[PDB]
Curated annotation (Swiss-Prot), chain A:
Function, in words: CRISPR (clustered regularly interspaced short palindromic repeat), is an adaptive immune system that provides protection against mobile genetic elements (viruses, transposable elements and conjugative plasmids). CRISPR clusters contain sequences complementary to antecedent mobile elements and target invading nucleic acids. CRISPR clusters are transcribed and processed into CRISPR RNA (crRNA).
GO molecular function ontology, one term from the record: DNA/RNA hybrid binding
Taxonomic source organism: Escherichia coli (strain K12)
Induction: Repressed by H-NS, activated by LeuO. Activated by the BaeSR two-component regulatory system, possibly due to envelope stress. Part of the casABCDE-ygbT-ygbF operon.
NCBIfam families, alphabetized: casC_Cse4
Example of a GO cellular component annotation carried by this entry: protein-containing complex
InterPro entries: CRISPR-assoc_prot_CT1975
Disulphide connectivity of cysteines: none
Protein name: CRISPR system Cascade subunit CasC
UniProtKB/Swiss-Prot annotation, chain C:
Protein name: CRISPR system Cascade subunit CasC
Disulphide bonds in the chain: none
BP terms from Gene Ontology: CRISPR-cas system; defense response to virus
Species lineage: Bacteria, Pseudomonadati, Pseudomonadota, Gammaproteobacteria, Enterobacterales
A GO-annotated cellular component: protein-containing complex
Function: CRISPR (clustered regularly interspaced short palindromic repeat), is an adaptive immune system that provides protection against mobile genetic elements (viruses, transposable elements and conjugative plasmids). CRISPR clusters contain sequences complementary to antecedent mobile elements and target invading nucleic acids. CRISPR clusters are transcribed and processed into CRISPR RNA (crRNA). A component of Cascade, which participates in CRISPR interference, the third stage of CRISPR immunity. Cascade binds both crRNA and in a sequence-specific manner negatively supercoiled dsDNA target. This leads to the formation of an R-loop in which the crRNA binds the target DNA, displacing the noncomplementary strand. Cas3 is recruited to Cascade, nicks target DNA and then unwinds and cleaves the target, leading to DNA degradation and invader neutralization. CasCDE alone is also able to form R-loops.
Description of what induces expression: Repressed by H-NS, activated by LeuO. Activated by the BaeSR two-component regulatory system, possibly due to envelope stress. Part of the casABCDE-ygbT-ygbF operon.
UniProt GO MF annotations: DNA/RNA hybrid binding; RNA binding
Keywords, in A-Z order: Antiviral defense, RNA-binding
UniProtKB/Swiss-Prot annotation, chain E:
InterPro entries: CRISPR-assoc_prot_Cse2, Cse2_sf
Signals that turn on the gene: Repressed by H-NS, activated by LeuO. Activated by the BaeSR two-component regulatory system, possibly due to envelope stress. Part of the casABCDE-ygbT-ygbF operon.
Name used for this protein in its record: CRISPR system Cascade subunit CasB
Organism from which the protein derives: Escherichia coli (strain K12)
Single GO cellular component term: protein-containing complex
Single GO BP term: CRISPR-cas system
Gene3D superfamilies named in the record: CRISPR-associated protein Cse2
Null allele phenotype: Loss of resistance to bacteriophage lambda infection, loss of plasmid silencing. Increased levels of 57 nucleotide crRNA and also 2 and 3 spacer-repeat units.
Amino acid sequence: MSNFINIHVLISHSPSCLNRDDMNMQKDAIFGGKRRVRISSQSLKRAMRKSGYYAQNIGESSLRTIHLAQLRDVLRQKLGERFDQKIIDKTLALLSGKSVDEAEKISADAVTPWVVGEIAWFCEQVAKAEADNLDDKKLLKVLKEDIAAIRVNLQQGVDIALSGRMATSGMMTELGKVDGAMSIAHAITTHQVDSDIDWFTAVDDLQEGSAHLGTQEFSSGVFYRYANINLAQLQENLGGASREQALEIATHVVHMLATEVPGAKQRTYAAFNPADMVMVNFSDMPLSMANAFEKAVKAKDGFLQPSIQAFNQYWDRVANGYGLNGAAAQFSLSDVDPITAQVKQMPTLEQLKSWVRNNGEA
Amino acid sequence: MSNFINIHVLISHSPSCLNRDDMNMQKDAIFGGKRRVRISSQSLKRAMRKSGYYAQNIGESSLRTIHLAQLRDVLRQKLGERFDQKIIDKTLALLSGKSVDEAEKISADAVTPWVVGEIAWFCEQVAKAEADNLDDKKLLKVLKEDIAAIRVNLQQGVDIALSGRMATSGMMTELGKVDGAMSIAHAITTHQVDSDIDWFTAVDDLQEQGSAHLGTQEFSSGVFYRYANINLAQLQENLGGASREQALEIATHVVHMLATEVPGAKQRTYAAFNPADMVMVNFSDMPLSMANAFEKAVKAKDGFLQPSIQAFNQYWDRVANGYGLNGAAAQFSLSDVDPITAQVKQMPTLEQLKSWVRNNGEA
Amino acid sequence: SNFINIHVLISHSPSCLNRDDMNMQKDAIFGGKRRVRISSQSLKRAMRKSGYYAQNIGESSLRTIHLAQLRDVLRQKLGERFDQKIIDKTLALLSGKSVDEAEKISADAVTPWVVGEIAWFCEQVAKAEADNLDDKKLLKVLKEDIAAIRVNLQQGVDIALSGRMATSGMMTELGKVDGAMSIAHAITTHQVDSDIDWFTAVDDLQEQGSAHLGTQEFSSGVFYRYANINLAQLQENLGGASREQALEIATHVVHMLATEVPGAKQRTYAAFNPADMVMVNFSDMPLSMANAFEKAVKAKDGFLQPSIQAFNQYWDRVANGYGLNGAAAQFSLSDVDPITAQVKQMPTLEQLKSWVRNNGEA
Amino acid sequence: DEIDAMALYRAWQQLDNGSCAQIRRVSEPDELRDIPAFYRLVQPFGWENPRHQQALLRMVFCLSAGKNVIRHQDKTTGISLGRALANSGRINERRIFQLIRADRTADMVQLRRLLTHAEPVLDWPLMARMLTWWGKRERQQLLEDFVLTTNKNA
Amino acid sequence: EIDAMALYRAWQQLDNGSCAQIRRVSEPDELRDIPAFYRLVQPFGWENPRHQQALLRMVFCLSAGKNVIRHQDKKSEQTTGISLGRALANSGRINERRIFQLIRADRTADMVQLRRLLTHAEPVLDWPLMARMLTWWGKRERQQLLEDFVLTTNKN
RNA sequence: AUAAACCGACGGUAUUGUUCAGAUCCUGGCUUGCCAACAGGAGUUCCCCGCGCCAGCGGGG
């Protein structure tokens, strides 16, 4: 009852537009026959990667790109003093195929997350390959033996270990395929939303008479974010890392999911709101509490309170009907008395995080 | 009424893409003149076979493949300490119909489910060729007599005993034909669905923020209705004359999986890990699907879930009274409802329902 | 009246209950519109091979024809063609008990195919007494035939209701047993939008991976099954035979039509649906109500309700115009009802079968 | 036999900024029923005959995209909506898959959002007739035209 | 199963006391509190709830005054009677923006506004039409009201 | 009792893995809702009980 760690977050946002269409439309989704404002999971994940908190507590994020011409120069810059450029070019060419050099624009198949640690390690290997004249096929055969040693490098690129990586060309198709370890859902509102429309203008300071016109869709909303971390898979993706090491990353994910908000239209719609509820529970089976809002919550005193209430009630029903999955802990800023008793109430967030660090104990 | 066990499941899913087309579109199907989102029965089956619950409670799933060149290596690894490589090669060669060359790649006719247990058994039986030499056709004729002895080894399969298999080549075409024993339907939504589209981008860290053409991913939420049916006698036969109680235990495992397991498609990015909101099980002399309860696409009052439960119960009452069926019928629901009528016993928890099944509907 | 008419409206979930030689759903153009079809042979096999059939017809009390009972009659119906000694010889070879030994239960009428076959046997033993091959010598060459008729003399109701078994040891023209129930092709009441399932086959040893592709046509729809029963023919082929017994069989036919479904792809699509409507009516002439759906039914709230409505509305204006007379009863799962009475409304199927069993009297 | 003239379009062109502003500010055609300037606009054609009402709601709703969103171009036969949206080059075919799969009010909404984004040139009476019926064959034909033109201009 | 015009007639013939009790009411729900209402509306629809809401509306409108709503039968040439919209338009005292606000109102509020309009309009109309529209009072009926008013003013 | 009769096209199958829609923008300026007006005629106020009765007085609901 402790492989999966489930993260449920209820967070309310003031009038804003945190996720947009290709036509300046608010991202939405139909649930329970009602329209909900949606925030795509990609937006949340990238919002986490490029956050300062991630930079402070987890490390450097990966470099996702197709431009191998730029990446060539970057790798030549950061690995210039440790390796020969002849080796770097060959390495990058082996992982994707086939850069060589001097080309103004080299593009891979799709946007790939590259970490400099893996590339440096591969340089260390292909150096030996050049030393003992190992054929590239033989080198592949050797490297495929111990994939864990490759996965150890993902400690300097945890976002890949969490979000996964897909490879089509190069040797990365045999060595760089990463599964898991974090499953994150698209954030949807717990209630129905009819999106408001802002009618703005642009004043020409050199004319007092006729009107300009502009439309920007926006809305406030109580979003439910769900996340899930497969600890075993996370340890595997980090090269057999300890569980204690994975749980810390998990806590950081809880914090970011509880605090981080996408920066879309935040200069004009400053919707910098913290989460009003964060519940974390350990289970061996992934469970999402989205069906707590299938019957779209109706505002009594706002949407937040009945959202918390509905959430708690559904968690109680699932807990009773399917049996208690494992340890659970809740942190709220609301005036709502919890109904289920087998969930530890945490006054502050850092206490919840501490509770997670100790594998759901004290 | 006690040969077929019918499993009905109403389960609501948050926005996701649990099963795709060849154009990466959501699988759909037209019911009652209305579009319903569909989940393939093959998808559900494989989702069950490769599930952790299956591994914990039922055992190891079958290995389906055409690559006999890899399969020979696998079988040599797992059976090498028990048999000689030539015997294993002759075994696999007899079963598949192809020849084990020690080559790099030799393929079979089609994807075949192989269970290592029955293969080991066939190694033991073909080790009788090491004795007074019987012709391979002779040995075949000997094995033809007792098929039950072969089906006993299928307790390390079960997914084959449940879903069956078909052979075209080798000796398996005459010894490995399994028919039953579980009939499962394609999961369709109880309501009309207009699928949404996620318009995504991919930020290039060395060029972006810049302009870009966008990508599309069709997704949707929805209340799905899963139906399954188990022929107990056929299961007992498929397991080599196994006891009824055993078949009922396996049946309960099927119930739990059908109630909890969700296909892992697009779950890293959409994560629709939702439990079933209703699970009803009823014993009958004849299989019975309650799909026509949603022939008229349910319309949302307070979501699609509650009117789905309601419609299900109403149609079940109508059919039950109309055709005079007498279960052996039990319903488990998370929601508070007004369901009926006796004796479709209400079970507060899923485990009580499974226990009710294990004791042949009398509990 | 002599004929019994059975009309069934039954809805099927997405499936493929009947394929052609190219793995596509069988169809039929009706009213200029394409309809999905379930061949009559598929339905009739689904019935004849069912367990209910085996219980109520496979093990009926009238399945065994005792030749010793037919001593006198066979002598007077074949006395014009054969001598008495030849007949007695044949019966003695077939039973095989010579003695007469009047059973004190000598029948009044005989089944036609019986006299048809035993006449052939009489011919054979005649030319066998002319050659002449002794009883043993000829019984050796007639082994398969004798066994062949011996198994048929224990399946009276099966042959009487469904016909001979496509491999019965029958030779004479009278041996061609038809009826007594006629099953029509089941067509959809509406124009069908066929779906195409696009499946793959995953290889567990190369999950990278090249996918095994495949397609399969499937469709849901409301089918109209029609069948009729000739009671006189059923009584003649069980001759016998009281009308009440024939009715008792007719009830079984009604039940089988209301319940039984072909097993094509039911392991993967599972269209185990029960009939949503079934009407039975006596008549001097069999009539299908297919022209009720000659104009393709269009979906208002599903296809089922407007199909029921179309059927009833057709029966209202058309019934009296044609030679339908009486009596009629209908068992359905949803209103409305036909405005015309003289069509008793039955709450359950068992009440309907009981209604049929009492010759349609209330 | 009663047809809605092209005059409507002209009227829409000539209508004042106020009423047009009242009309453009609308989410659904029923809300178009809600506003009076609409009734004043659509009376001659006209609104008082229920056979025409739905068609008028659709047409006016589409025109409500803007005064110069739908650009009329005379023709053998004029450019169709599919051909127009395809020629614009700004529209992705998936959104038209959406358009063909949409139901009732939703589709019209989706349609309007497209027009504003497309700035298409087309023969207005064709679009008028297609909006008059808007059956399954109109949808299908729309998608056909779009796909074929895009395939023919790639 | 339909409410007759007799109600109107009854309202005409009822004494000043009960009319005073009914007239001074703010909301249709508050109309339930007084007995004279029950005595008036007893023959037509109680206790069959299907009419109750409608009755609440109808009487409420009638509660505007004894001779506020002037009834005029449909002319043989008219084919259809003068409608509430056409009436309010012909009165000339009503501004269209308040009918806009009338179409935008919800539940009790709209009735509150409607009564307030009638008193200011003194309209002439075919009472069964208004009764029929009040029985359902759906969105289409509202929009139709606005149609009649705006169209009447623009056409005449 | 019809080129009829008797009469399954059957079994086996994840469509999978990667992805911010982003950045810029006052709806501004001008408007009385004014003119006329007793709420007064009236003791009805629906059901019991006690005592009166050219009258009426009380007690309960």
